[PDB]
């Protein structure tokens, strides 16, 4: 997971939103030791979400847990803290994480 290559390089997510996608992936996996500044733990979390080592029954990967996230509150907090309009970007990240480079 710490390697030179990146999971999100095979998706439509821009590199400026890679930490946003990794924070979504880490918060979706119910991790609590995670800190925003720790990029390594973010990469481990997104790697275990997209390529789990022990997937559950009839599930290829843990991407289905993203549907429990409340993206609206996350977009509201992003707009409050950083003055970024990213409401559609969270949806695009979610769709790309669930299926990397669909046929549109």
């Amino acid at each position: 997971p710490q390697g030179e290559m990146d999971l999100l390089d095979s998706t439509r997510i821009h590199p400026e939103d890679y930490s946003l996608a990794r924070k979504m992936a880490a918060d979706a996996l119910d991790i609590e030791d995670i800190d925003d500044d720790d990029e390594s733990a973010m990469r481990n979390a997104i790697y275990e979400m997209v390529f789990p080592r022990s997937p559950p029954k009839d599930e290829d990967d843990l991407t289905f847990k993203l549907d429990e996230l409340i993206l609206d509150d996350y977009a509201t907090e992003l707009e409050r803290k950083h003055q970024l309009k990213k409401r559609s970007t969270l949806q695009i990240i979610k769709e790309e994480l669930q299926s990397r480079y669909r046929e549109i």
Binding site: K23, M24, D27, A28, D30, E32, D35, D36, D67, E68, L69, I70, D73, Y74, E77
Partner: peptide, 11 residues
């Protein structure tokens, strides 16, 4: 110190 934001999950 503040508290790190944790994304709420559907219930």
């Amino acid at each position: 110190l503040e508290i790190s934001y944790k994304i709420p999950k559907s219930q």
